[PDB]
Amino acid sequence: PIQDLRDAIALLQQHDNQYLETDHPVDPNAELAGVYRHIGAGGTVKRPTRIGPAMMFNNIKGYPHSRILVGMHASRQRAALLLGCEASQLALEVGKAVKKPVAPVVVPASSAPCQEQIFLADDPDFDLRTLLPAPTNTPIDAGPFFCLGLALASDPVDASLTDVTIHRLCVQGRDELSMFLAAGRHIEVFRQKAEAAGKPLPITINMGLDPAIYIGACFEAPTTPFGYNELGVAGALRQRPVELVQGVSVPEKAIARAEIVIEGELLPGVRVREDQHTNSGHAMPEFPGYCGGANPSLPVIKVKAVTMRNNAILQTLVGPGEEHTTLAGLPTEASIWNAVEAAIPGFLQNVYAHTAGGGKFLGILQVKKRQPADEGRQGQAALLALATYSELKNIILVDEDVDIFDSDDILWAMTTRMQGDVSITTIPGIRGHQLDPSQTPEYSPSIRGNGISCKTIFDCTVPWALKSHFERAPFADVDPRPFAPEYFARL
Amino acid sequence: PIQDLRDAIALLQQHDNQYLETDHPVDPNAELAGVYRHIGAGGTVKRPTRIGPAMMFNNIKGYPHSRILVGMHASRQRAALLLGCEASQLALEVGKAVKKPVAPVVVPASSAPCQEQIFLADDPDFDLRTLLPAPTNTPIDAGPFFCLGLALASDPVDASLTDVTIHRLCVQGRDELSMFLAAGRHIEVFRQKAEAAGKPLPITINMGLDPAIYIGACFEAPTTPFGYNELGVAGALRQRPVELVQGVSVPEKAIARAEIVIEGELLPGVRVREDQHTNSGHAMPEFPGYCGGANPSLPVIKVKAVTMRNNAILQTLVGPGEEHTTLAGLPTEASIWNAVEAAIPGFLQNVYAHTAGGGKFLGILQVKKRQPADEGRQGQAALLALATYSELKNIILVDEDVDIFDSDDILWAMTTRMQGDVSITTIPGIRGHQLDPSQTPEYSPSIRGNGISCKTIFDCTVPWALKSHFERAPFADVDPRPFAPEYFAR
C-alpha cells in the first residue's frame, strides 16, 4: 500500500525500465534537464526525446547531500502502474476516486517524516540557495525553479476555506521565492485578501509526494470546512487518508510524509521581476514546448523554514513534457468523459488529451455511431468537449476502430476518412490559452488579443450512411504468441 | 397561498387582463382553438395573435356542464405572478426550488376533491368521447387531444421507482387514448418492462393543476424511493407538499386536488395509428409552429375510470404557442444558466429561451465583458449553451444594455453591433431537432438526414477594445411617475 514517494519508487523498481538511478556527477543548472531530455522527458520537448524511466540523480554538483528525482509521472503507463489500473482507463479510474473521496487527517509531528530535519530561516547560516538543488531547465530561464510544489494555504478571513494546488517557484534569494498565482484561483484570492489588510499569507510548499497526491490534486474538488479536499482523491486511490501535520514555523498544515516542505509567507505589497537575476527575458519551458516570458511583477514567498526527511529526495520535472501531459491530461479527459457521457450516454468510447497539446490543447474523441440518429452527434461531442474545457484548441473525432493513442492511426483517419471542405469546421475568436504562441493578433486577422484562438473540429468519423464502405481490412483473429514465444516475451 | 388550479384562477382575477371568461357557445372541435388564437395563444402561432389572459370557456357545444381552460401558462408575466417573482428571474426562481424540493404527501380519499365524482368505465353508458370535451387544435389534426396530461407511473417490478411526466393524448375510442412516450424516459422503461411481461402498466393522467406543478414537472429531478420527485419543485414553490391519493380503479396515485383524473392501463402488444379515424396524416400543431406528422405506431391507454371535481375544469392548451414557450423555455434557460455560471462565474447576466423558438430553438445570451480576458468568452458562452441543450439551433449574443426580452432590441444589436463577415459563425452537421422543418437534406447540402442542422452563433456583443464607442445615448435618470400619475396607473 503506497503512502509516500519512496513506496512508489519501490513499486517502480519491480518493473523493467520504470526507474533508473545514476551516480555520475550532474550539474543541476541546465545539465540534469539536458540529460533527462534524452532519457525520458517526452511530450512536446524537442527531438530527440522519448518515454523512459523515472530517473534519480544521486550525485549533484555543489550539493553533496542531495539527490534529484524527475519523470515520476512522465509516462501514462507508469502512472497506471503507480495507481494499479490500465493506462487506457486511467482517467476513469481517477474519476471514480474523485466521486468518493477519503478525507485527510491530522497527525502529530512524531508521525511526520517531513519534519525529521528542520532548517529555520532564523539561522544566520540559512541559505535556501545552498540547502536545495533547484534545477535550471534551460540556460535562458529566469533562474532555478522548483516545478512540483504542492501549495497548501487557507483564506485569511475564513480559516475553514482551504486550497491545494501545484505550483512552480523561482529561487530569488537566500530566503525568497517568486510564485505565479493564476488570477481567480482560490489561493490568489486568499493572497489578495491578506494583502488588502497589509498582512502576509502563510503557505507551505510540499515537494516529493505519493504520485496519487500529485495526480489527484490536478482535479477540481468540492469544498468542505478545513477539507483540503484535493487530497481526498489520493485518499480514495489508496483507501488511506492523506496525513497532514502542523507547520513548525507558520500556522498552516503540511504533507506529513512529504520529502521537503518549504514553509513561508506571501509578502504584502512586494513584487519582483521573475528574471531579475538573469535578465534572460524568459521564465522556463511551458507545456506547449516553448519557453514562456518572464513575469514582470510576481508575489514573493518569504521563507521561514525548510523541513525535510533524512536523505530527502528533491522531486521536480523536466520538459515539462510528458510529465505535464499526465498531470494536466487526465483531468482534461475526465471532464470530457463526464460531460459527453451525461449528455449522450454510451456514445463516447474514449478520449485522449493528446501529449502533443501537453494534455490541454488537443482532444481526440473516439465515438461509435450505433444508429442513424448518431449522425450529427459527433459534432455535439466536440462542442461538449470545447465547452467543458475552455483551454482546448482543436478536436479530432474518430470512430471506434481507430487507436486514439496512436498518432499514425489518427493521421490515417485524417487521410482516408476526411474531406477538407466538408469535415473541418473553424470556430473563430474563442478564448484559449496565452501560452499557445499562435494565439495572437499577429498570427490571424480574426484574433483580437493574446490567448484568443480559432478552434477547429476535424471530423474524421465515417458518415453514418457510408459505413458499409469503410470497414478496415479484416485480418483473421489469431493468437500470435505460439508462433514466436520468446519474441512476445519482450513486453 | 396557492394550492390548486382554482386558487391560481383567483390570483389572476386580482389582476387586469390575466383571466377572461366567456359564455358564448364554442365548438371544442377547432372553434375554441380558433378563438384563443386571437386572444392569447401567442408564441409561434400564426398571426394575428398576442399575449393575453388565460381563458375559460363556460359553454361548450355538446357538453352542457363542462368548461375548458386554456392559456394558463401562456404568458411569462402571468407565470411570474402565479409563482410570485419577477418575470426576468423566473428560471432562476424555479431553479432555487429545484435544489430544495419538498416531498409530496399521501392523503385519504376524503381529502381529494379530484374524487368528488367517479365515472367507472365498466358502466355500459360510459363514453370517454362524450364525458369530456377534448379540443382539436386544427381541422387537420389526428383527432381530439388532451395536451396537459401529467402522468404518474411506477416501475412494475420495483414500486419504489416513480416518474412524473407531461403528455398529450389523442382520444381514439370510447375507452382508449393513444399516447406518445419519449424513448429513454423513465415512464416508458416502465411500460417496456410491463409489456415484455405481457402485462399492462397502470397510469394516472392528471389534468387541471396548480401552474406550479406543470412548471416544476418540466425540470429534471432526482429519484428517491416512492419520490414522485418532479412534484417536489412545486412543493418547494408553494412551501406545502403536493397531496396525492390512491386511484379508485388502478393501483397508482393521482393528484388529490386535480380537476380531472383519467385512470387506466397502457396495454401490452397493441399499437394504433394516430390519424386512425381521419387519415389527415397529421398529429397536431408542434412548438415550432407547424403541424406534426401523425405517429404511425402509438401505445394505448385503456381507461378504467375518470374522476373529477364538481364543476370540473378541463385544462388544455392552444398553439401550443406561448404556453409551450413557458413550460419548455424555463428549463432551457435554467440549464444554460447553470452551465455558464459554473464555467464563467459572473459573466452571464441573463438568458432567454426565445418564444420564437418555442423555448427550445433560439437562445439569447446576455453577457457583460468586465475585463480584457472576457473578450473571447462570449463565444465560449454560446458553445456552453449549444452543448448543454442539443435541441438549440441558433445563439444570439448581446451585452448588458440590450433587453433580451425585447425583439426590437435584439434586432437593433444585430444591426449596429454586428458585421456579417466577422460576427456570424456557422457550425454545420450538428444534430438538432426533427420538428424544425428546415433541418432536412433538401434544405442544405451539408445536412445528412432529418433533424440535423447548421447551428449559427450571431455575436452581437461590442468587441472589448471598441466599447468606448458603443455607449447608448445617455438620457438622464428621472422618475417619470409624477409627470403623468394616472397614465402610469395602467
PDB file of C-alpha atoms in Angstrom, chain A residues 343 369 372-380 383-384 386-390 422-423 425-431 448 452 455 457 459 461 463-464, chain B residues 343 369 372-380 383-384 386-390 422-423 425-431 448 452 455 457 459 461 463-464:
ATOM      1  CA  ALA A 343     -25.366  14.237 -22.339  1.00  0.00           C
ATOM      2  CA  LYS A 369     -22.263   5.602 -34.285  1.00  0.00           C
ATOM      3  CA  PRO A 372     -28.996   6.683 -37.688  1.00  0.00           C
ATOM      4  CA  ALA A 373     -29.615   9.385 -35.033  1.00  0.00           C
ATOM      5  CA  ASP A 374     -25.930   9.212 -34.002  1.00  0.00           C
ATOM      6  CA  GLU A 375     -25.088  11.037 -37.232  1.00  0.00           C
ATOM      7  CA  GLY A 376     -24.608  14.622 -36.094  1.00  0.00           C
ATOM      8  CA  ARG A 377     -23.833  13.706 -32.501  1.00  0.00           C
ATOM      9  CA  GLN A 378     -20.109  13.550 -33.260  1.00  0.00           C
ATOM     10  CA  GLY A 379     -20.111  17.337 -33.667  1.00  0.00           C
ATOM     11  CA  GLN A 380     -22.178  17.575 -30.469  1.00  0.00           C
ATOM     12  CA  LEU A 383     -18.990  21.040 -28.759  1.00  0.00           C
ATOM     13  CA  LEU A 384     -19.335  19.377 -25.353  1.00  0.00           C
ATOM     14  CA  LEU A 386     -14.816  22.604 -26.166  1.00  0.00           C
ATOM     15  CA  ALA A 387     -17.458  23.907 -23.720  1.00  0.00           C
ATOM     16  CA  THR A 388     -16.299  21.765 -20.794  1.00  0.00           C
ATOM     17  CA  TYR A 389     -12.535  22.552 -21.119  1.00  0.00           C
ATOM     18  CA  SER A 390     -12.018  26.104 -22.454  1.00  0.00           C
ATOM     19  CA  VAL A 422     -16.649  19.086 -45.614  1.00  0.00           C
ATOM     20  CA  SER A 423     -15.148  17.704 -42.369  1.00  0.00           C
ATOM     21  CA  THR A 425     -15.224  23.372 -39.010  1.00  0.00           C
ATOM     22  CA  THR A 426     -13.489  26.535 -37.741  1.00  0.00           C
ATOM     23  CA  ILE A 427     -14.807  28.478 -34.742  1.00  0.00           C
ATOM     24  CA  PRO A 428     -13.015  31.852 -34.622  1.00  0.00           C
ATOM     25  CA  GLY A 429     -12.409  34.230 -31.760  1.00  0.00           C
ATOM     26  CA  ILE A 430     -12.788  31.875 -28.754  1.00  0.00           C
ATOM     27  CA  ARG A 431     -10.588  32.373 -25.704  1.00  0.00           C
ATOM     28  CA  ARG A 448      -8.409  40.282 -31.133  1.00  0.00           C
ATOM     29  CA  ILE A 452      -7.797  34.018 -28.208  1.00  0.00           C
ATOM     30  CA  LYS A 455     -10.796  26.453 -32.604  1.00  0.00           C
ATOM     31  CA  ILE A 457     -13.067  20.454 -35.249  1.00  0.00           C
ATOM     32  CA  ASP A 459     -14.450  15.298 -38.091  1.00  0.00           C
ATOM     33  CA  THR A 461     -15.698   9.759 -38.458  1.00  0.00           C
ATOM     34  CA  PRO A 463     -20.637   9.424 -42.286  1.00  0.00           C
ATOM     35  CA  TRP A 464     -23.357   7.111 -40.971  1.00  0.00           C
TER      36      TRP A 464
ATOM     37  CA  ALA B 343     -17.850  27.703 -16.095  1.00  0.00           C
ATOM     38  CA  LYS B 369     -17.418  41.936 -20.639  1.00  0.00           C
ATOM     39  CA  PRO B 372      -9.954  42.221 -21.478  1.00  0.00           C
ATOM     40  CA  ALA B 373      -9.945  38.482 -20.822  1.00  0.00           C
ATOM     41  CA  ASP B 374     -13.737  38.383 -21.307  1.00  0.00           C
ATOM     42  CA  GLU B 375     -13.180  39.080 -24.992  1.00  0.00           C
ATOM     43  CA  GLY B 376     -13.388  35.582 -26.453  1.00  0.00           C
ATOM     44  CA  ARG B 377     -15.583  34.302 -23.622  1.00  0.00           C
ATOM     45  CA  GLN B 378     -18.863  35.313 -25.285  1.00  0.00           C
ATOM     46  CA  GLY B 379     -18.212  32.614 -27.893  1.00  0.00           C
ATOM     47  CA  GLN B 380     -17.423  30.252 -25.033  1.00  0.00           C
ATOM     48  CA  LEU B 383     -20.625  26.911 -27.001  1.00  0.00           C
ATOM     49  CA  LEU B 384     -21.676  26.147 -23.406  1.00  0.00           C
ATOM     50  CA  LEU B 386     -25.137  24.605 -27.570  1.00  0.00           C
ATOM     51  CA  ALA B 387     -23.581  21.792 -25.548  1.00  0.00           C
ATOM     52  CA  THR B 388     -25.968  21.755 -22.589  1.00  0.00           C
ATOM     53  CA  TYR B 389     -29.121  21.875 -24.777  1.00  0.00           C
ATOM     54  CA  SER B 390     -28.647  19.973 -28.001  1.00  0.00           C
ATOM     55  CA  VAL B 422     -16.983  38.728 -38.840  1.00  0.00           C
ATOM     56  CA  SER B 423     -19.726  38.155 -36.280  1.00  0.00           C
ATOM     57  CA  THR B 425     -20.119  31.598 -37.077  1.00  0.00           C
ATOM     58  CA  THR B 426     -21.749  28.542 -38.704  1.00  0.00           C
ATOM     59  CA  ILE B 427     -21.389  25.040 -37.255  1.00  0.00           C
ATOM     60  CA  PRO B 428     -22.686  22.512 -39.833  1.00  0.00           C
ATOM     61  CA  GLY B 429     -23.974  18.961 -39.444  1.00  0.00           C
ATOM     62  CA  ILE B 430     -24.953  19.034 -35.730  1.00  0.00           C
ATOM     63  CA  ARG B 431     -27.987  17.060 -34.647  1.00  0.00           C
ATOM     64  CA  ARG B 448     -27.086  14.381 -43.989  1.00  0.00           C
ATOM     65  CA  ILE B 452     -29.530  17.683 -38.377  1.00  0.00           C
ATOM     66  CA  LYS B 455     -26.130  25.928 -35.983  1.00  0.00           C
ATOM     67  CA  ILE B 457     -23.762  31.873 -33.449  1.00  0.00           C
ATOM     68  CA  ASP B 459     -22.087  37.585 -31.926  1.00  0.00           C
ATOM     69  CA  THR B 461     -21.510  41.975 -28.411  1.00  0.00           C
ATOM     70  CA  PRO B 463     -15.589  43.956 -29.201  1.00  0.00           C
ATOM     71  CA  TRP B 464     -13.875  44.717 -25.902  1.00  0.00           C
TER      72      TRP B 464
END
